[PDB]
Every structure is written in structure tokens, then in C-alpha cells.
């Protein structure tokens, strides 16, 4: 679908069998979700944001359905202010910016 | 134009008489530019995201051209690790997300 930007680009996603709301973020290299449990192994990682750096847990090859579109990739979990869908998964569902 | 997300969506913008490289950022409503000495009055403001909050200067009614597309609105200037073009200006140039 085509999404305008007058309002936040919020969408419903499915991960680990649970539904959640996330923000389509073209300004994010990765997909970062608020604290939650995810099956499998994870590795410690550090990422940067507008206010500085934080520590997160990196889960690889995780299935994520975004607005009915399937993606399987890296998902970071940590103290993010909101669940965000970054470029790593946006590219998987064929999302582009247009003007 | 159509910008894919394989890499950070960087574009050239014109502001305060300068040409800069900025990232189209659907994850923010505000537009934040790296420290620059813009003339005019401003108001203090605090913005937050991953890592916490930073202090910036808010300038209003500032003309900003994005890839030849004219816009005008609020621009925040401060110690951001990157020039960010938010939804406030993205809507002005008719930018959408499509998949």
C-alpha cells in the first residue's frame, strides 16, 4: 500500500506468535523492539540513536510479518522508546520512499 | 523519484544558504540538523529517542529545499549525530512509503 506521512507510520506486526505495533522507520538501519522474550540464542550488541548508545540483544533469522508481508531477519531487543521496523526488514517487504 | 532502502536514504538539501546531505527519516516528525550557525530567533527544545535526549535550538519558518522540492517549516539545530529530515517536511514534498 501507499502510506502518507501526516501521521506516524504505525503498523501491526506478528513476531514470536504475538501481535504488536511498530513504526516504519527509514531512519533506522535495524529493527529494534521494546523488551520482550524471543526464542533462540541472542548476542550482546550496542547501537546508536539520537540521544546516544544503548545495549541490546541481537536475535538472528527471526520471522516477522509486517502488514501481511513476510520477512525473516535480525531483530534487536532493548530500551528503545518505541518498536521500530528498520531498513534491514523494510527492504525485505519491498518498501521504498517516493516523491 | 524512488529511493530504495538498501542503504541509508541520503539526499541533498539546501538550507540557510548551504547544501548538505540529509537522511529521509519517517521515524521522526521533527527535522534535525547538525550544528550550524543560522541567523534569527529560536527557542530551546529537548528531543529524545534511542540513547536518550539532546538539547537543540528550534528555528521556525525556515526554507528548506529537498532534491529540488521546496519546503518550509521548523528545523531543530543541535548535536545530532546526523542530519535528519522528518515527516514535517516529508509531507510538504509529497513523500510516501510504498510496498
Amino acid at each position: 500500500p501507499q502510506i502518507t506521512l501526516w501521521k506516524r507510520p504505525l503498523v501491526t506486526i506478528r513476531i514470536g506468535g504475538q501481535l504488536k505495533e511498530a513504526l516504519l522507520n527509514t531512519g533506522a538501519d535495524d529493527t529494534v523492539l521494546e523488551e520482550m522474550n524471543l526464542p533462540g540464542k541472542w548476542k550482546p550488541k550496542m547501537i546508536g540513536g539520537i540521544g546516544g548508545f544503548i545495549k541490546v540483544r541481537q536475535y538472528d533469522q527471526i520471522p516477522v510479518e509486517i502488514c501481511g508481508h513476510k520477512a525473516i531477519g535480525t531483530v534487536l531487543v532493548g530500551p528503545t522508546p518505541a518498536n521500530i521496523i528498520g531498513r534491514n526488514l523494510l527492504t525485505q517487504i519491498g518498501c521504498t520512499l517516493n516523491f | 523519484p524512488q529511493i530504495t532502502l538498501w542503504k541509508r536514504p541520503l539526499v541533498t538539501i539546501r538550507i540557510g544558504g548551504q547544501l548538505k546531505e540529509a537522511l529521509l527519516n519517517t521515524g521522526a516528525d521533527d527535522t534535525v540538523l547538525e550544528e550550524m550557525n543560522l541567523p534569527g530567533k529560536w527557542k530551546p527544545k529537548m528531543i529524545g529517542g534511542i540513547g536518550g535526549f539532546i538539547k537543540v535550538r528550534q528555528y521556525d519558518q525556515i526554507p528548506v529545499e529537498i532534491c529540488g522540492h521546496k519546503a518550509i517549516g521548523t528545523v531543530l539545530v543541535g548535536p545530532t549525530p546526523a542530519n535528519i529530515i522528518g515527516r514535517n517536511l516529508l509531507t510538504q514534498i509529497g513523500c510516501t512509503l510504498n510496498f
Binding site: G49, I50 | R8, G27, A28, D30, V32, G49, I84
Partner: peptide, 8 residues
């Protein structure tokens, strides 16, 4: 290194 810019 990874950069992510959501703003609240």
C-alpha cells in the same frame, strides 16, 4: 555503529 533515528 548501527544508527537508528526514531524521535518521540
Amino acid at each position: 555503529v548501527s544508527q537508528n533515528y526514531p524521535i518521540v
